Amino acid sequence: GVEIETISPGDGRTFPKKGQTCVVHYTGMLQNGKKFDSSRDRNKPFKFRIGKQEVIKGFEEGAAQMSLGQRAKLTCTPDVAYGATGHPGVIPPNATLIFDVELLNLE
């Protein structure tokens, strides 16, 4: 369900594989443009493994199709991101998500 809209190409050579960790830099935002998350504010990139079931599916399946240095706009669906319950306090139920992801390093 998650889709990818390229913003800046990252030479499309190195792709995330099972058993690795990616360093990303993203500024998530709701469908109405209201920003609800970012990693450039805290000035620390987001490091996460692939296939370990630690981040949302709409993020991991989308990052598994990107390359090093490639900026992408990942549009996810509510069922692949949070479902009919959302995130208590922040994300309302049945809400679509948009992430402006940029891969810095692929380890």
Partner: protein
């Protein structure tokens, strides 16, 4: 005797008597003024405390509860007038306000009374939507919540949802927020249940309360070019100009740099086009009087639409864009790296003096490209499309103001200006 059924109106309805009695009883519990001696203030406090205790130990708080119950069975002064008389109908509102004020004054300070009658909170929060005494009910709820922590033990999710719906229905009231603050903590101790309920039911949707965000300062640059087409003198209705970039940085501090370029209209035949007022995050495309392009989307009226293009990417360094503008039948078009884009803003209002313009936030080195001594084109203009160095009127200078006004980083020595005229020029004698 009047509300039970239709009976003969030989009843004693002391409307003015009970109004005067309530007006006296409200002042009977008036708290002492702060501009008073300490000993006299303490004496008045003790006096009103003893008064409130004696008034409670007779159970008349339940009596005024029954009174407001029997009075709430109507809907408005018009509903009460044709049943109980014109005077009673017009005084029902004042009587209910006085009753709520008395109920609040009976419990302004006591800790025992709130504990005693907290079991009646199921009725107050339900009648909170009476739309005529919501202020009084909210006052009573606030004074009963701020004093007794045991009243918070019976506040359930339905009551919090009712309060939040009241806040959503009656607008932005600074009293509901104090009620919620008192529900969060009562006496140096917090209630995690109520805190979580507030956090999960108040601001997941962001429609309320007032949101906020940190955006960048964007500005725009435009040359001294104006394009007005009508019957009579025309200017070939065809223009073209290129634009390149030297250095660009996608995220300078926290967000992606605003970087757009296009053509902006005007208001009538004068400067100062309409849009984002001034000094915002609005460049070109953020209004119905400008049309811009940033590499991925087409902006028009602060609404972006993605369009396909060979190797569609943001305006990275060393990127050449070419803007073409035909006036009458077709509209503005953009060609990135020579290959044109697959979109344009057809059928738009031609009223106004169009001009090229580029908007940027920070970290940018932009170069306009014209013909002659001003620059050199990178590509070939399509047949017919002229340029701005030829659009300039004969025997006038050509410079670059920002867009409208004195958006210059200067000290107090800024020439602040008022309104202007439509250039006095924007047929022989018979």
């Amino acid at each position: 005797a009047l509300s039970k059924k239709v009976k003969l109106p030989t009843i004693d309805l002391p409307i003015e008597s009970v109004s005067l009695s309530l007006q006296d009883l409200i002042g009977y519990f008036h708290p002492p003024d702060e501009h008073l001696e300490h000993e006299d203030k303490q004496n008045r406090l003790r006096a009103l405390k003893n008064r409130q205790n004696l008034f409670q130990e007779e159970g008349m708080i339940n009596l005024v509860l029954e009174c407001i119950d029997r009075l709430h069975v109507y809907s408005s002064a018009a509903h009460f007038a044709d049943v109980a008389g014109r005077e009673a109908g017009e005084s029902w509102k004042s009587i209910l306000n006085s009753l709520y004020e008395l109920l609040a004054a009976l419990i302004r300070g006591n800790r025992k009374n709130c504990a005693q009658f907290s079991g009646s909170l199921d009725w107050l929060i339900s009648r909170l939507e009476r739309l005529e005494a919501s202020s009084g009910i909210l006052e009573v709820l606030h004074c009963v919540l701020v004093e007794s922590p045991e009243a918070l033990n019976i506040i359930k999710e339905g009551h919090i949802k009712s309060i939040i719906s009241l806040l959503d229905k009656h607008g932005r009231n600074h009293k509901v927020l104090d009620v919620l603050c008192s529900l969060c903590v009562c006496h140096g101790v917090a209630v995690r249940s109520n805190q979580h309920l507030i956090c999960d039911n108040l601001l997941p949707g962001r429609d309320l309360l007032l949101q906020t965000r940190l955006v960048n300062h964007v500005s725009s640059m435009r040359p001294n070019i104006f394009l007005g087409v009508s019957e009579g003198s025309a200017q070939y209705k065809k223009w073209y100009y290129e634009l390149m970039v030297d250095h660009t940085e996608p995220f300078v501090t926290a967000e992606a740099t605003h970087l757009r370029v296009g053509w902006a209209s005007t208001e009538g035949y004068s400067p100062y086009p309409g849009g984002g007022e001034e000094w915002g995050g609005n460049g070109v495309g953020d209004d119905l009087f400008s049309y811009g392009f940033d590499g991925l989307h087409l902006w028009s009226g602060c609404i972006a639409r993605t369009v396909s293009s060979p190797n569609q990417h943001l305006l990275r360094t060393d990127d050449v864009i070419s803007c073409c503008l035909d006036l009458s039948a077709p509209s503005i078009s953009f060609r990135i790296n020579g290959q044109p884009v697959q979109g344009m803003f057809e059928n738009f209002n031609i009223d106004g003096l169009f001009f090229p313009v580029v908007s940027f936030s920070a970290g940018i080195k932009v170069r306009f490209l014209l013909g002659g001594r001003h620059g050199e084109f990178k590509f070939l203009p399509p047949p017919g499309y002229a340029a701005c160095y030829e659009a300039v009127l004969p025997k006038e200078k050509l410079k670059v103001e920002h867009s409208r006004e004195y958006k210059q980083e200067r000290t107090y020595t800024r020439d602040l200006l008022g309104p202007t005229v439509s250039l006095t020029q924007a047929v022989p004698v018979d």
